[PDB]
């Protein structure tokens, strides 16, 4: 399974970090981490499909890498429109895809 | 027994890209062609940072250098199925992305580094400069005058690498009539022209050419000429003209193509960003002056202006070439077909297309002028002639043993107003001529 | 402005049969896969099935194989998902999604343009 | 200043394989060795049809060319397990069978195309022909007279390709005592001798040899000799002697061998059918005559008759060789062993033996005579001498700087009845000799 | 017409490694440089037995040769995972272990076999020996005196192989501006230096050098000098100096490395044991004496003593080299990546690293002396000079056309007490000098 | 399965063609079509084992290729002894061999 | 003049056991495979089984595996086929055929020298 | 002087559960496999199971799979073997052995340093 | 299975041979023969793990090879301390290891 934070808060204009982890093992480039976002009653939008790759049309204030055997998503200069959910997914075995829990990020 | 004595410059602190005035005032009753030592220094480049998977930083010479994302072509717009990119050292070692001070650019010297050093030389005695010449005249003289036997050692004076050959042991061969053991021969070389991380200091032993310093009996007397007023001026080459940068990082691409035979293709593309080159000094640069105790056949050469211009990506190895050149690339692959199921065996189950990191570049030279027409007012000279006659047959039949047969179509021999009937017209033609020979 | 629309969700008794239709516009449906992602209420997202570009190959998950049949219709650009042997756990939100092939190809790696999704309850 | 003037033939409409009489009547107070231009034409071959899987059509030179069926050897009789055949372009492109106008044969010029052009030349003035010579004496003179320095350009006059070298970038190496960067060097060339679909028009600048045209002071006066009666006769070579055909179709064969290491062998064999070659004209064939304004050491060469005979498959590149030759073939393969189950890991699970389409042919030359015996009636001359003495040591110690050391064992130097003591006796020995030098 | 007559030795039964006295008493009114024939014999080695899997027999030159067990490194102590060893013929054929008379060592001649033959020669007439010299003087003369044109044939007199070139057919290439057909060129050679099972009998035609036998006018009269007292002494080379053994057996190693990409590495290491070499006779060894009917520029060469010492593993090809050398090894591999599951397609499922049996050895030569200082008592001569000046520029500018530019840094030109300022000090420096030129 | 003509007739000295097809897909050289013949109470004789290959001893008046995504067998200069049966077989999957129906060719 | 003869066919009650013997002459039986082809009355031909050159490897069809056992006897050159669990559909004509190995090898591609065949009824 | 010690053997009723513990000293237990070999009284030796270096992969035999659970513990260098569904044939001598990887790796080829072994009876 | 001798005897200072064979097939290098020894109440000691390889510390009076399609173990200069058992093991299939019976070698 995938362990991820239940909730998280951020002040406006600050920097936030989110961590996605495995139950027992570590995380490397092979696990293929991917970060999405799910605003209410809107379709999910791809943010980070490989460890650090991102598609076109997404603002360049997003990031993401591997730190401390975890998948880390860092948001800098967050606006007030990020009242959404963030979740993590990973690729294990040869054809296994496992998604993680969601954080309802809150901006004060 | 005679001994040659040295002399030091009076200006002091030589610098690259600046004019240097050397005395050579009075030492020697008779003097002939001079020799100038030049000891160069280190050539380590500056440390750089690895790119990020989305970076599209601007490159050099107006060419954009990109680090494509996964699943895209070289451009970051057209989607390509099954493309994976990675950073690699030109020697194959992995390079971690996004790490400060991750790689260093390779530094290599331009072909004939000691020949571009003397871009301009003036021989003067209290004004009224007696002699002028530059690098192109020396290149023409090298291509025609010096014999082929007196070459290899001369190739060491100007800091140009020379090739060495090795073997590969015994191999079994078949002989067809109407089995044997044979050995293979390979050629390889290393030196200033080979891109290296740390260039050892060079030793240029540059030679000075003169009309009166070719024979011992043609030397002018030192007492008659003003000894104290002789001052030879040399324009040293720019620091950006001798050395050059070779990419120290490569963007390896891996693919996968479906269908009955799976194909795994690997390709490479350099990531070239112009860094900072360490300053190169010229120490112990004495001139070991050789001091001892007591119309006609004409050479002409044609060169495109793009050869010397800085816009040329390969200007460091095209400056001495006469005639526009093109690059031929042979990319060799390593095919290997494998079958797993040993039943139907109609087609190979899987394949491989491993390719070398660096290609093999051949500088093919082509004629620039289809026809020649040298129409002077006083004498008609030659008109409407093919380039092959003046390039090959004239040196072959005229000149004797001293002359060497030309190798490039740009330069030719004609036994001043000169016209051309070329088709590659871009206002880039430049002419050099020698007539004293 | 490519759009994707799911249809066929609604209240249904357990043990019945359900059809989910996925339609798309603004893009070439020929050269793209179709994946189905199930999101349970208050839980994570699961992967369900894969259909190839022309329907020649297909794959499924461990807990749903034998009950779900995926199919394509490239003439009118519509992907069909039949599902039988309904139980209570099927209450979730189903998302019809597109995918490219970077590194891994068959199960999907990029997953562009998620659909709005349709809620199905027992 | 002196300028050389041209002259045109009077017969008109030159044709290959026919005798041509040129005037050179009176132009020039003094004349020396002549030069003849010859501009060739296109060399595209005729379109052909792909064979059928069962065809066994007759080939060229009496050799049968077959397209084997699936499951058979090269012959259509012996059954071979797991053999599959396909048609391929020499460059690897597939060729569909049974399709009209599917491929074209490659056309390539024989080695030294301009040397075989003058198969016979006569220098005469109103009968009583003064000079006779042919191609073999010119080949002997080339192998001995012309210096090695005046070679590359002379290699362009007779339409022979010259090699060019390229590099391969930096490579990492180890140095053993009691790491470094090196560069590899590769050689490659292209031109008339390279088989190509379409041959650019060649430009032969053939040189004429004479005894009195080697020095300016040895030229006979034009006024004393009859100017109006000079008529030089040239027998142009046959159109089938210069150009030749290289196969434009290959029969790729693939195999599969069962066992612990399942190998996959791929081999190739040409499908050569003599097509029709487009007629080649001789246009703009002026003779740029050079006009200006005012016993001993003997050379012999021995050649098998099979070198010139049309029955020789490689007669186009063996005609100039002195001494019978054989062909050595190195077929290089690309081995690759793969393991799938990672639990035995002792013997390779699978193997590959990919082979190149075209082999590497080495023309190894061997001596034909183990002994020489020149027994003349007037003088005994030499008897029972080894060939190595007259091949190597005599040119080395005698001749001076003008002579060049021989490369082929067939030709030799002796400082007329000539006998031989060879073992390869087939009544094929032919002798060429020059003594005026 | 003049004829050269032979002469036979009077001692009889020539043997290797012993002094031979030849008369050359009175034949010829005038005589010049002599020629000595020497026909060698077979060189087949002795049969040997294959080793056992646990054997660690002592090798040659103090180096231990081991046959490692399965699952160990080259040493029989450190355990290595997944290592399997097998015996193979250098040509790839399997060799069964533990079988009597299973393989034969290859035999190859040292470089320039005919040059080491005359390790010492004395020219004397009834005591008071007029002339002395050895092999090093001949090597120094060879590297400088003989012209580069008179080389290839001269390489056949001393039993040195010469290279021959072949082609590889047409290939398709891309041309970049701002498609074509090209041909590749390969070089290969075979002969005495190529290790072979059975060596054809050689034929050395050794040349004798003298100060008075370089010009016909400098020959001393035979009548004035004592004809009956002339006795030339030659010290023939040792049988262990010319021929040498190349390993006829190889210990192939195969590996397997786990992880996501399985890697199969194949390596080789020779098993060299000095066997017994068959005795080589010198029959038909007459001296074909050539009989006809009627301060300055100085050469020096510096050589390490290890070049001649028997402890050198490569003493057979380093004896003639001036300056200590190192060996560069390029081991080329054949990579091939394969994927089986066509789902993840991220990294190769399996790989291969097949390597050639024999590496490519490059003999890189390096300068031995950083500085030169020839300080004689009478004249200061040269002091504190770089080696590059005397190695390259002096031959380039002095000597004329006869001299050839040096290729090795060890030897040089200076126009007796000699000192050195080298850093590679091991009391191994040996000097050779020529002044009569 | 394999679809092939129920029956077919030919006049003496004429040219006849026979077609063998798949139910849904097309036919390429991968399927390796093969044409036999089966005279009554005699063993079948191989005629065309690959698309166009034939064994020794078979008269050269037979042919066969792929046209219109079908396996085509063409008989030219037919005699009166061809009163026999003709059927088609194909290779599918990795080890699947499927034979087709037979035509009782009739000569008038 | 190579010949092949089949034997062992005849009327048999359903659910019994049958043996089919295939003998050959005029050719080397060592270096050839043996295939068995079943032709139903009024239907097409089907492939049944494969036996290797020396009997090491064997293969069967989907609808007959588990009931048919093929075997070889290289001594006096006879191929045996045991078949059990007889039913009504077994009524057909069985042909013992030879094969080479071009392209595909194990299932047979060339299939030279068909036998006369033997009729088996229930 | 490397040593291996087995423990956990003794009289037990059929159908029970047993634990066999193999401990080692004098060698690095991290980089070595552990195999278990059963020797029946008056019969030959048999191979039972394989445990990898870090316990990622395991393998068993045909007649014992489903009842044998091999495991490792690299903290204090001890290998465990759980066995259930006891029957009378289990009466034998069990040996825990080390192994290298030459040629074949997973099943073991060299098998250095056999333990003294422990007798287990029903 | 593996067939091996039931019992065997040797005189002191003599030479003895032992044979290990298959039921039906032959024996080659791929089978991987291995010879052990098992003295009473002592752990078995590896003697010959490949066909002819031996580990360190084992006396050099042992041997072993393949002869007559059998695995042969030869003992020369045997002492009186060889009162032990000898058995043979072989490797078949891809992961099959089969051990053989034991000989209670006796020295007179």
Residues 8-37 of D with CB under 8 A from B: 33, 35
In the structure encoding, which two tokens stand for residue E228, read together?
Answer: 């009956």
3-state secondary structure of B152: helix
φ/ψ of E144, rounded to 5, equals -120, -45
C-beta atoms of F94 and B343 within 8 A = yes
| Domain limits for position A18 | 2-102
CA distance B410 to B428: 13
C-beta atoms of E346 and A94 within 8 A = no
CA distance D344 to H111: 16
Option in F32, F91, F94 nearest B341 (CB): F94
| Domain limits for position H80 | 3-114
Distance (Å) from the alpha carbon of A12 to chain E's nearest alpha carbon: 40
Transcribe D354-415 into DSSP letters. Answer: EE-SS-EEEEEE--S-S-EEE--SS---EEEE-HHIIIIIHHHHSS-SSS----STT-EEE-
For residue E108, how many other CB atoms are within 10 A of its CB?
A: 23
| B294 contacts chain F (CB < 8 A) | no
| Residues of chain H neighbouring E71 (CB-CB closer than 8 A) | 100-102, 109-110
Option in D343, D346, D347 nearest I95 (CB): D343
Please name the residue of chain E whose CA is at the shortest distance from the CA of residue C109. E344
Distance (Å) from the alpha carbon of B150 to chain D's nearest alpha carbon: 12
> Does E touch C (3+ CB pairs < 8 Å)?
yes
φ/ψ of B389, rounded to 5, equals -65, -50
- Number of folded domains in chain F? 1
| Residues of chain H neighbouring E70 (CB-CB closer than 8 A) | 102-103, 109
The answer to whether the beta carbons of residues A44 and A38 sit under 8 Å apart is yes
3-state secondary structure of C104: strand
CA distance B323 to B408: 7
Residue F108 lies in a domain: no
How many H helices and E strands in chain C?
Answer: 0, 9
The answer to whether the beta carbons of residues D383 and D417 sit under 8 Å apart is no
Distance (Å) from the alpha carbon of D173 to chain E's nearest alpha carbon: 6
Q: Which secondary structure element, helix H or strand E, spans residue D330, and what is its range?
A: strand D325-330
Resolution of this PDB entry, in A?
A: 3.5
3-state secondary structure of B113: coil
CA distance F72 to A21: 62
Residue F107 lies in a domain: no
The answer to whether the beta carbons of residues E176 and B329 sit under 8 Å apart is yes
Chain I: touching chains (3 or more CB pairs < 8 Å): D, E, H
CA distance I51 to I34: 7
Burial of residue D341, with CB atoms counted within 10 A of its CB: 0-12 exposed, 13-18 middle, 19 or more buried: exposed
CA distance B431 to B420: 11
Please name the residue of chain E whose CA is at the shortest distance from the CA of residue H110. E71
C-beta atoms of D405 and E183 within 8 A = no
- Residues followed by a break in chain F (C to N exceeding 2.5 Å) are none
CA distance C3 to B426: 53
Residue of D81, D169, D188, D363 for testing the chain B interface, max B β-carbons within 10 Å = D169
Owner of token pair 């004395």: E122
> Does C touch H (3+ CB pairs < 8 Å)?
no
For residue E278, how many other CB atoms are within 10 A of its CB?
A: 14
The answer to whether the beta carbons of residues B404 and B147 sit under 8 Å apart is yes
| Residues of chain H neighbouring D342 (CB-CB closer than 8 A) | 105-106
3-state secondary structure of B154: helix
Chain C: touching chains (3 or more CB pairs < 8 Å): A, B, E
CATH number at residue I94: 2.60.40.10
| Residues of chain A neighbouring E346 (CB-CB closer than 8 A) | 30
C-beta atoms of H110 and E71 within 8 A = yes
Distance (Å) from the alpha carbon of I84 to chain H's nearest alpha carbon: 15
CA distance D364 to B174: 11
CA distance H15 to H122: 9
Chain G: touching chains (3 or more CB pairs < 8 Å): B, D, F
Q: Report the half-sphere exposure of E15 (CA within 13 A, side-chain side).
A: 5
CA distance D404 to I85: 82
C-beta atoms of C106 and E343 within 8 A = yes
Rg from Cα positions in chain E: 28
φ/ψ of E108, rounded to 5, equals -135, 145
The answer to whether the beta carbons of residues A87 and C44 sit under 8 Å apart is yes
C-beta atoms of H103 and D346 within 8 A = yes
**What does the H/E/C string look like for chain E?**
CCCCCCCCCCCCCCCCCCEEEECCCCCCCEECCCEEEEECCCCCECEECCCCCCCCCECCCCCECCCCCCCECCCCCCECCCEEEEEECCCCCECCCCCCCCEECEEEECCCCCCCCEEEEEEEECCCCCEEEEHHHHHHHHHHCCCCCCCCCHHHHCCCCCCEEEEEEEEEEEEECCCEEEEEEEEEECCCCCCECCCCCCEEEEECCCCCCCCHHHCCCCCCCCCCCEEEEEEECCHHHHEEEECCCEEEEEECECCCCEEEEEECCECCCCCCECCCCCECCCECCCEECCCCCEEEEEEEHHHCCCCCCCHHHHCCCCCCEEEEEECCEEECCECCCCCCCCCCCEEEEEECCCCEEEEEECCCCCEEEECCCCCCCEEEEEHHHHHHHHHHHCCCCCCCCCCCCCEEEECCCCEECCCCCCCCEEEEEECCC
CA distance H93 to H121: 9
Please name the residue of chain I whose CA is at the shortest distance from the CA of residue D341. I94
Residue H110 lies in a domain: yes
β-strand pairing of I2-4 with I45-48: unpaired
CA distance A27 to A90: 9
- Number of folded domains in chain C? 1
Residue A108 lies in a domain: no
CA distance D155 to D149: 11
Distance (Å) from the alpha carbon of I44 to chain H's nearest alpha carbon: 6
Counted residue by residue, chain H has a size of 122
- Residues followed by a break in chain I (C to N exceeding 2.5 Å) are none
| Residues of chain G neighbouring B346 (CB-CB closer than 8 A) | 103-104
Residue F18's alpha-carbon distances to B334, D304, F25, F42, F55, in angstroms, are: 45, 60, 18, 22, 20
Q: Which secondary structure element, helix H or strand E, spans residue D143, and what is its range?
A: helix D135-144
Buried b (16+ CB within 10 A) or exposed e, B145-179: beeebbebbbbbbbbbbeebebbbbbbebeeeeee
Burial of residue G10, with CB atoms counted within 10 A of its CB: 0-12 exposed, 13-18 middle, 19 or more buried: exposed
In sequence order, which residues have a C-beta less than 8 Å from that of residue B91 and are 6 or more positions away?
D170, D171, D172
| Residues of chain E neighbouring B34 (CB-CB closer than 8 A) | none
CA distance F62 to D124: 68
Distance (Å) from the alpha carbon of B69 to chain C's nearest alpha carbon: 10
Residue D229's alpha-carbon distances to D9, D14, D20, I49, in angstroms, are: 14, 21, 16, 99
| Residues of chain E neighbouring C103 (CB-CB closer than 8 A) | 344-346
What is the DSSP code (8-state) at residue B135?
H
What is the DSSP code (8-state) at residue B94?
B
CA distance B105 to B196: 9
Option in D156, D172, D182 nearest B392 (CB): D156
Distance (Å) from the alpha carbon of G66 to chain B's nearest alpha carbon: 22
Strand partners, E187: B185, E165
The answer to whether the beta carbons of residues E65 and E117 sit under 8 Å apart is no
φ/ψ of G68, rounded to 5, equals -115, 140
Strand partners, G68: G83
| Residues of chain D neighbouring F50 (CB-CB closer than 8 A) | 53, 69-70
C-beta atoms of F53 and D52 within 8 A = no
| B226 contacts chain E (CB < 8 A) | no
> Does I touch B (3+ CB pairs < 8 Å)?
no
Distance (Å) from the alpha carbon of A16 to chain C's nearest alpha carbon: 22
Residue C106: name the closest of C71, C68, C56, C40 by CA. Answer: C56
Distance (Å) from the alpha carbon of D339 to chain I's nearest alpha carbon: 13
The answer to whether the Cα torsion of G41, G46, G50, G53 is positive or negative is positive
By what technique were these coordinates determined? cryo-EM
Extents of the domains making up chain B: 295-324+366-437
Residues 234-253 of E with CB under 8 A from B: 246
Residues 295-334 of E with CB under 8 A from D: 326-330, 334
Distance (Å) from the alpha carbon of C61 to chain B's nearest alpha carbon: 23
- Residues followed by a break in chain H (C to N exceeding 2.5 Å) are none
CA distance I96 to H46: 10
Owner of token pair 């379409």: D198
β-strand pairing of C78-83 with C68-73: antiparallel
For residue B380, how many other CB atoms are within 10 A of its CB?
A: 11
C-beta atoms of H44 and I50 within 8 A = no
């Amino acid at each position: 399974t995938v362990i991820h934070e239940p909730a998280m808060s951020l002040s406006p204009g600050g920097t936030d970090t989110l961590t996605c982890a495995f139950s027992s093992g570590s995380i490397t480039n092979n696990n293929y981490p991917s970060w999405f976002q799910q605003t209410p009653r809107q379709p999910p939008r791809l943010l980070i499909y490989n460890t650090n790759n991102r598609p076109t049309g997404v603002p360049s204030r997003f990031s993401g890498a591997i730190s401390g055997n975890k998948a880390a998503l860092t948001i800098t200069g967050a606006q007030a429109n990020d009242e959404a959910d963030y979740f993590c997914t990973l690729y294990i075995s040869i054809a296994d895809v496992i998604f993680g829990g969601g954080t309802h990020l809150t901006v004060l | 027994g005679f001994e040659y004595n040295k002399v030091r410059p009076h200006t002091g602190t030589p610098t690259l890209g600046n004019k240097l005035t050397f005395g050579i005032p009075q030492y020697g009753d008779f003097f002939h062609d001079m020799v100038g030592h030049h000891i160069l220094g280190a050539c380590h480049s500056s440390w750089q940072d690895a790119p990020i998977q989305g970076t599209s930083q601007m490159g050099a010479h107006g060419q954009l250098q990109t680090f494509p994302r996964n699943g895209y072509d070289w451009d970051n717009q057209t989607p390509l199925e099954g493309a994976v990119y990675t950073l690699v050292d030109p020697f194959g070692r992995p390079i971690v992305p996004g790490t400060k001070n991750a790689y260093r650019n390779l530094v290599y010297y331009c072909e004939y580094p000691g020949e571009r050093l003397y871009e301009n030389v003036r021989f003067d005695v209290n004004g009224n400069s007696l002699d002028e010449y530059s690098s192109d005249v020396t290149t023409l003289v090298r291509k025609f005058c010096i014999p082929g036997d007196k070459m290899t050692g001369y190739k060491h004076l100007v800091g140009q690498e020379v090739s060495v050959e090795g073997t590969s042991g015994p191999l079994l061969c078949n002989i067809h009539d109407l089995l044997d053991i044979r050995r293979n021969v390979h050629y390889s070389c290393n030196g200033p022209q080979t891109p290296k991380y740390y260039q050892p200091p060079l030793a240029l032993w540059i030679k000075l050419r003169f009309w009166f310093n070719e024979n011992v009996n043609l030397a002018i007397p030192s007492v008659s000429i003003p000894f104290g007023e002789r001052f030879i001026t040399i324009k040293l080459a720019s620091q950006k003209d001798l050395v050059n940068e070779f990419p120290g990082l490569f963007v390896r691409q891996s693919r996968f193509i479906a269908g009955r035979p799976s194909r795994r293709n690997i390709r490479f593309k350099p990531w070239f960003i112009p860094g900072v080159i360490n300053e190169i000094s010229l120490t112990n640069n004495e001139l070991y002056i050789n001091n001892l105790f007591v119309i006609e056949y004409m050479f002409i050469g044609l060169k495109p202006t793009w050869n010397i211009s800085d816009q040329n990506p390969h200007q460091h190895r095209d400056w001495h070439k006469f005639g526009h050149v093109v690059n031929a690339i042979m990319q060799p692959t390593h095919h290997a077909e494998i079958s797993f199921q040993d039943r139907d065996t109609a087609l190979p189950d899987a394949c491989s297309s491993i390719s070398d990191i660096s290609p093999v570049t051949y500088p093919i030279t082509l004629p620039i002028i289809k026809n020649i027409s040298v129409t002077a007012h006083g004498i008609n000279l030659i008109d409407k002639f093919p380039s092959k006659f003046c390039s090959s047959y004239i040196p072959f039949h005229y000149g004797g043993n001293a002359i060497k047969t030309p190798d490039d179509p740009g330069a030719m021999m004609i036994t001043f107003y000169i016209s051309w009937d070329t088709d590659y017209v871009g206002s880039i033609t430049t002419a050099d001529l020698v007539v004293s020979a | 402005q490519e759009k994707l629309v799911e249809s066929g969700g609604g209240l249904v008794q357990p043990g019945g049969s359900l059809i989910l239709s996925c339609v798309g516009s603004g893009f070439t449906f020929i050269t793209y896969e179709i994946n189905w992602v199930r999101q349970a209420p208050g839980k994570g997202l699961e992967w369900l099935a894969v259909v190839s570009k022309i329907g020649d190959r297909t794959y499924y998950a461990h807990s749903v194989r034998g009950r779900l049949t995926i199919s394509r219709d490239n003439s009118q650009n519509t992907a069909y998902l039949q599902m039988n042997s309904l139980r209570t756990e099927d209450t979730a939100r189903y998302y019809c999604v597109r995918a490219w092939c970077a590194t891994t190809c068959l199960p999907g790696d990029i997953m562009d343009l998620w659909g709005p999704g349709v809620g199905v309850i027992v």
